[PDB]
Amino acid sequence: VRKETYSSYIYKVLKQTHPDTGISQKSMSILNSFVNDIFERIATEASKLAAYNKKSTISAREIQTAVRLILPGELAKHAVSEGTRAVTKYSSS
Amino acid sequence: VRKETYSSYIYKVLKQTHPDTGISQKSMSILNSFVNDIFERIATEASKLAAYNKKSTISAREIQTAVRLILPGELAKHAVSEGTRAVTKYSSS
Amino acid sequence: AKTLKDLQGWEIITTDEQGNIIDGGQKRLRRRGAKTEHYLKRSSDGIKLGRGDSVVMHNEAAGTYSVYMIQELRLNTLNNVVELWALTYLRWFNELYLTAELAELQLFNFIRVANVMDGDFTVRYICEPTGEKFVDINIEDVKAYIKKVEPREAQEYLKDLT
Amino acid sequence: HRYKPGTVALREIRRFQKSTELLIRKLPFQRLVREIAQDFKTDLRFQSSAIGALQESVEAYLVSLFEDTNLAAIHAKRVTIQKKDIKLARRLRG
Amino acid sequence: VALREIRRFQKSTELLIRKLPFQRLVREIAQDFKTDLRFQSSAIGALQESVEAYLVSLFEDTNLAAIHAKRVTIQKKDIKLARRLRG
Amino acid sequence: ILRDNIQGITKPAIRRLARRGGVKRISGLIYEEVRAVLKSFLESVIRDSVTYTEHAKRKTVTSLDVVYALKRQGRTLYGFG
Amino acid sequence: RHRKILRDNIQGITKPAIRRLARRGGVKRISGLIYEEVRAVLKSFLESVIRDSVTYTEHAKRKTVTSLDVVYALKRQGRTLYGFG
Amino acid sequence: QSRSAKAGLTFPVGRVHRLLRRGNYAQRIGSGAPVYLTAVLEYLAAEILELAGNAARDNKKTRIIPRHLQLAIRNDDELNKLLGNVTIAQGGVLPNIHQNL
Amino acid sequence: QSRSAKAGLTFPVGRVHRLLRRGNYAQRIGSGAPVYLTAVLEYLAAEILELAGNAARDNKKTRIIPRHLQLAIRNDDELNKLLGNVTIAQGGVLPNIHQNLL
DNA sequence: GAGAATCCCGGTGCCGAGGCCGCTCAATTGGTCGTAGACAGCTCTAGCACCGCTTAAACGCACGTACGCGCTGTCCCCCGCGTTTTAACCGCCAAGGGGATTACTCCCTAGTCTCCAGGCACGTGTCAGA
DNA sequence: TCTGACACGTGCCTGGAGACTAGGGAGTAATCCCCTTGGCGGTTAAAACGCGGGGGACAGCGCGTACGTGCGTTTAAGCGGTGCTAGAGCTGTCTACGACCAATTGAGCGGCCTCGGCACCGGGATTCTC
């Protein structure tokens, strides 16, 4: 009771590209823990970086900086390229 | 302008036991950064630990457990021995 | 350009290997072989800004126009949505010199493409910021090289040339 | 007279190990840092404090790495380090 | 048998340290603080998996050190280095 | 009451762990040392988890505090917290 | 302006500088296959740390890198420095 | 129609927003920050599931197991650096053979 | 008087309380948390300054330069473990020689 | 069979710190509204602990052999000394990139009703393994 | 060719959106400074270059104690079935505790002297190699 997880949406996006394959219960917990840990790391990094510049309003730029520092390699350059795809789809719509 | 530092208090506690030995400004900055880093580590550990048990406030026991976590060895057993003493005569005053 | 307001007249085209597709740009799949490029073209005339071209821009302080040969572009940065690293040309003040220094090119400083080649202008030799050490080397021989490989090996190559 | 190789080395070790002065030259290190940052983007402003902080951090990291490589070499019945020792030290810490 | 065991074990998944000795060892190492301490069933498995990962990493590190040392036999000095080389 | 059980992890277990590690030949002098390694690592982790549990007003050490202690030491574990 | 460029200053950390660094390390002698790779290791470490510091300093609409952000970047990597931040 | 559907992201926006606000991370969290975090998390999940499926297809299996996840995260070198200090449960180890055996 | 003198210490409880409040760390802060944190910080400062003074007395010096501070931060065997991967500016290296070097 | 790499008598520059001044700014008193958890009860649940039926594996014993550290020879190559050389730092000029604080205002939004919504507690029809 | 787990319809209630005030903050556009590159001339602590040399890395060996493979026999293990009770997580109190509202006062960092501790000298001893 009162268990907030990301299982449903991760499973839906699992059938977003390869609906033929499934996922086990144990590996799903591994993925949920990994995504929770990386989200916590990004949030902590963003808050810590914002507190360093006398900033108390966490906006898109702080999260972008935190994630690009956390994400290593050119993959980060790709991931950031996805983020601005959403806000442009959010402000316009 | 408005340069935050702990120089006066560290110097005052230095004269509490070592009235004859001075300290340089370069080393004073080192001690100030050391105090700030230990403080930040304890505070972030206490906040994360409070978030683990759905806690809403940080009490004396929160920081006590945080310093028990961070401080290694018998020194930690001394630190709490110096901590809970003060509160023992802080509330009853 | 800075915000999206200054870059409202441009689009993004993703050339995976040799295609003119959009596909959104790195939609969902990333793996080995990520040498894809993203380029932009204004809608007024329809001229594309590839990786290895050359443009002309005016300086806010100097005032005199200068030719910059674009070497690389990075999309979705912190201060700028697109950041263009180019090589400056040492103006004589019509033969143009070449420098190996990297400079940032802004969107609103671009007015017209300068398709210079070895002999609307002509190049003479590559020079240095010190004012000497000029070698008779053209640009058409290195444009294909910098277009075929990653930018990194491109700057080691151009350093090895000098 | 000329000292045999292996006696000035030891007092050299103490004389650079007891003290803590800056050995890496400040201006070349600043130039290297500026040129490395230029590979990210041009027209960047650097102050003396940041250069000093970077130099101190590099000093500490390289001293730690060299101590680790010396330990690895002396563990292998050896007194000098080669690229294999550096690779072993690097792969086991990051 | 060792040569086949190499990729028999790197392909395997089942745990090696037996659960019952691990439970008793944890009980004895935890009673040194307070008497009658309780542990969850899944906590024991998680801790054993962590111990597995740490020991596998340490043994890979000492294998690298040994093959660097022109030898295939690891000893106590190798693990002492493994502590003293990375911390 | 319960003693002389540190030898629960016996030498064939260390041999199997070494085979998974990627070695072929191991000396017999490393068994006591790896036992001490396990003892020290487990003592540290158990101390951290016990402090977590004591703060949490619990007495049954669950997986959550163990994973949190692992995360605090830079050894984050997935699938259990 | 920016009419200045350095051509391959990777050897800025010179040979006897590496020698003295190793001497502080506590070694007896250094082979010739070190001076060419330690500079590459230093270059990679700088390419990481300076990039992190550049992100820190340009996050806040600034082009002048301070020492506070450098200290914070080293702290994020587990190699924190005291007294400069 | 929903906030997540407006940006076209499968991952939630309200859930992550409330977890940030109740998470004692910041008293003030922006409007574009949650959607940006949702987008980057969705991209990371898509990439890791792509790698897991690629690894699973080579083992002739139609399910995602921790062994496949660890194999995929270890083959990817830039993702390995981020997942350096982690311990995958029931995932085995990455096979590797040196040049001195 | 202030709570700093009430607790019988020399470190500011009010300053750490205010900057904890402004540090975006917790919505609510207990009454005993600032005083306990001040106590532990004062104890750590006293320990490190005492170690630095002891190191200075061995070198026949009065001013504490970072060398003696590094000696203090590394000589103590449980206190050094806390600062496992720290970098001290102008700190130096521990005076020691392994027997396999001479 | 004898040199330096410094020690310590002792004066002064010389940068640096401890009193001395000094004044906006946050610490202190404590109802009040909100708020959150120590008790108070409970409740169900899961592994301690035991018992029992099977069962993979350790404890050495024996032995061939991959292996390891010292021997001995070979070369090798980096360090110390002598000579050349080479640019950092001293001390500034000096304007220029960029920052110490208003401000604002208008839109981002906390709060709060407010209206609605979605996915997990189940679950029986399917599907990787032996 | 037979299974134990995994996945679609399934409701509502805690949560996600819908929407109207007023806190309240930032990139626009402003003062004068806060550090800093470029280079002006010399040089002196190092940086390169040549060369001699001796400690050490490389390579085969056969002694030689040490172990994996082959092999009994227990020995604790691998799982099924319960008796059961300490405890994690469930709602409710209400009374102790946080933020903040007026209002006030000691303080600790901007500036300024007034000393204050160390380096380097003329010039001895100090444990270094053979």
Coordinates of N, CA, C and O in Angstrom, one line a residue, chain A residues 9-18 75 78-79 81-82 85 89, chain C residues 14 16 22-31 38, chain H residues 4 7-11 38-52 54 57 76 79:
Chain A
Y9 N 5.3 3.1 -16.5 CA 5.7 3.9 -17.6 C 7.0 3.3 -18.3 O 7.2 3.4 -19.5
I10 N 7.9 2.8 -17.4 CA 9.1 2.1 -18.0 C 8.7 0.9 -18.8 O 9.2 0.6 -19.9
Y11 N 7.6 0.2 -18.4 CA 7.2 -1.0 -19.1 C 6.5 -0.5 -20.4 O 6.7 -1.2 -21.5
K12 N 5.7 0.6 -20.4 CA 5.1 1.1 -21.6 C 6.1 1.5 -22.6 O 6.0 1.3 -23.8
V13 N 7.2 2.2 -22.2 CA 8.2 2.6 -23.1 C 9.1 1.4 -23.5 O 9.8 1.4 -24.5
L14 N 9.0 0.3 -22.7 CA 9.6 -0.9 -23.1 C 8.9 -1.5 -24.3 O 9.5 -2.0 -25.3
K15 N 7.6 -1.4 -24.4 CA 6.8 -1.7 -25.6 C 6.7 -0.5 -26.5 O 5.8 -0.5 -27.4
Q16 N 7.6 0.5 -26.4 CA 7.6 1.6 -27.4 C 8.5 1.3 -28.6 O 8.2 1.9 -29.6
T17 N 9.5 0.5 -28.4 CA 10.3 0.1 -29.5 C 10.4 -1.4 -29.8 O 10.4 -1.8 -31.0
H18 N 10.4 -2.2 -28.8 CA 10.4 -3.7 -28.9 C 9.4 -4.3 -28.0 O 9.6 -4.7 -26.9
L75 N 27.7 10.9 -25.0 CA 26.3 10.5 -24.7 C 25.5 11.7 -24.0 O 24.4 11.9 -24.3
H78 N 24.2 14.0 -26.4 CA 23.0 13.5 -27.0 C 21.8 13.7 -26.0 O 20.8 14.2 -26.4
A79 N 22.0 13.4 -24.7 CA 20.9 13.4 -23.8 C 20.4 14.9 -23.6 O 19.2 15.1 -23.6
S81 N 20.6 17.1 -25.8 CA 19.9 17.4 -27.1 C 18.4 16.9 -27.0 O 17.6 17.4 -27.7
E82 N 18.1 15.9 -26.2 CA 16.8 15.4 -26.0 C 16.0 16.4 -25.1 O 14.8 16.6 -25.3
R85 N 14.3 19.2 -26.6 CA 13.2 18.8 -27.4 C 11.9 18.8 -26.6 O 10.9 19.0 -27.2
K89 N 8.7 21.6 -26.9 CA 7.3 21.1 -27.1 C 6.4 21.4 -25.9 O 5.2 21.2 -26.0
Chain C
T14 N 19.6 16.6 -40.0 CA 20.5 15.6 -39.4 C 21.0 14.7 -40.5 O 20.3 13.8 -41.0
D16 N 23.0 11.7 -41.2 CA 23.6 10.5 -40.5 C 24.9 10.1 -41.2 O 26.0 10.2 -40.6
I22 N 15.6 14.6 -41.4 CA 15.4 15.3 -40.1 C 15.3 14.3 -39.0 O 16.2 14.3 -38.1
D23 N 14.3 13.5 -39.0 CA 14.1 12.4 -38.0 C 14.2 12.9 -36.5 O 14.4 12.2 -35.6
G24 N 13.9 14.3 -36.4 CA 14.0 14.9 -35.1 C 15.4 15.2 -34.6 O 15.7 16.2 -34.0
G25 N 16.3 14.2 -34.9 CA 17.7 14.4 -34.5 C 18.1 13.6 -33.3 O 17.8 14.0 -32.2
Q26 N 18.7 12.4 -33.5 CA 19.0 11.5 -32.5 C 17.8 11.1 -31.6 O 17.7 11.4 -30.4
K27 N 16.8 10.5 -32.3 CA 15.5 10.3 -31.8 C 15.5 9.4 -30.5 O 15.2 9.8 -29.4
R28 N 15.9 8.1 -30.7 CA 16.0 7.2 -29.6 C 17.2 6.3 -29.5 O 17.5 5.8 -28.5
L29 N 17.9 6.0 -30.7 CA 18.9 5.0 -30.7 C 20.3 5.7 -30.8 O 20.5 6.6 -31.7
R30 N 21.2 5.3 -30.0 CA 22.6 5.8 -30.0 C 23.5 4.6 -29.8 O 23.3 3.8 -28.8
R31 N 24.5 4.4 -30.7 CA 25.4 3.3 -30.6 C 26.7 3.7 -31.3 O 26.9 4.9 -31.6
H38 N 24.8 17.7 -37.7 CA 23.5 18.5 -37.7 C 23.9 19.9 -38.2 O 24.7 20.5 -37.7
Chain H
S4 N 2.2 15.3 -19.0 CA 3.2 14.5 -19.6 C 2.9 14.3 -21.1 O 3.8 14.3 -21.9
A7 N 4.1 17.3 -23.5 CA 5.5 17.3 -24.0 C 5.8 16.0 -24.7 O 6.9 15.9 -25.3
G8 N 4.9 15.0 -24.7 CA 5.1 13.7 -25.3 C 6.2 12.9 -24.7 O 7.0 12.3 -25.4
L9 N 6.2 12.8 -23.3 CA 7.1 12.0 -22.6 C 6.3 11.0 -21.8 O 5.4 11.3 -21.1
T10 N 6.8 9.7 -21.9 CA 6.1 8.6 -21.2 C 6.3 8.7 -19.7 O 5.4 8.5 -18.9
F11 N 7.5 9.1 -19.3 CA 7.8 9.2 -17.9 C 6.9 10.4 -17.3 O 6.6 11.4 -17.9
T38 N 12.5 14.8 -16.8 CA 11.7 13.7 -17.4 C 12.2 13.3 -18.8 O 12.4 12.1 -19.0
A39 N 12.6 14.3 -19.6 CA 13.1 14.0 -20.9 C 14.4 13.3 -20.9 O 14.7 12.3 -21.6
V40 N 15.3 13.8 -20.0 CA 16.6 13.2 -19.9 C 16.6 11.8 -19.3 O 17.3 10.8 -19.8
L41 N 15.7 11.6 -18.3 CA 15.5 10.2 -17.8 C 14.9 9.3 -18.8 O 15.3 8.1 -18.9
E42 N 13.9 9.8 -19.6 CA 13.4 8.9 -20.6 C 14.4 8.5 -21.7 O 14.4 7.4 -22.1
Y43 N 15.3 9.5 -22.1 CA 16.3 9.2 -23.0 C 17.3 8.1 -22.5 O 17.7 7.2 -23.2
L44 N 17.7 8.3 -21.2 CA 18.6 7.4 -20.6 C 18.0 6.0 -20.5 O 18.6 5.0 -20.7
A45 N 16.7 5.9 -20.1 CA 16.0 4.6 -20.0 C 15.9 4.0 -21.4 O 16.1 2.8 -21.6
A46 N 15.6 4.8 -22.4 CA 15.5 4.3 -23.8 C 16.9 3.7 -24.2 O 16.9 2.6 -24.8
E47 N 18.0 4.4 -23.9 CA 19.3 3.9 -24.3 C 19.6 2.6 -23.6 O 20.2 1.7 -24.2
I48 N 19.4 2.6 -22.3 CA 19.7 1.4 -21.5 C 18.9 0.2 -21.9 O 19.4 -0.9 -22.0
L49 N 17.6 0.4 -22.2 CA 16.8 -0.7 -22.7 C 17.2 -1.1 -24.1 O 17.1 -2.3 -24.4
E50 N 17.6 -0.2 -24.9 CA 18.2 -0.5 -26.2 C 19.4 -1.4 -26.1 O 19.5 -2.5 -26.8
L51 N 20.3 -1.1 -25.2 CA 21.5 -1.9 -25.0 C 21.1 -3.3 -24.4 O 21.7 -4.3 -24.8
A52 N 20.2 -3.3 -23.5 CA 19.7 -4.6 -22.9 C 19.1 -5.5 -23.9 O 19.3 -6.7 -23.9
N54 N 19.7 -5.4 -27.2 CA 20.7 -5.8 -28.1 C 21.5 -6.9 -27.4 O 21.9 -7.9 -28.1
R57 N 19.2 -10.2 -27.4 CA 19.1 -10.8 -28.8 C 20.3 -11.7 -29.1 O 20.1 -12.6 -30.0
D76 N 29.3 -0.9 -22.8 CA 29.2 0.5 -23.2 C 30.3 1.2 -22.3 O 30.1 1.3 -21.1
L79 N 29.0 4.6 -20.6 CA 28.1 4.3 -19.5 C 28.7 3.6 -18.4 O 28.2 3.6 -17.3

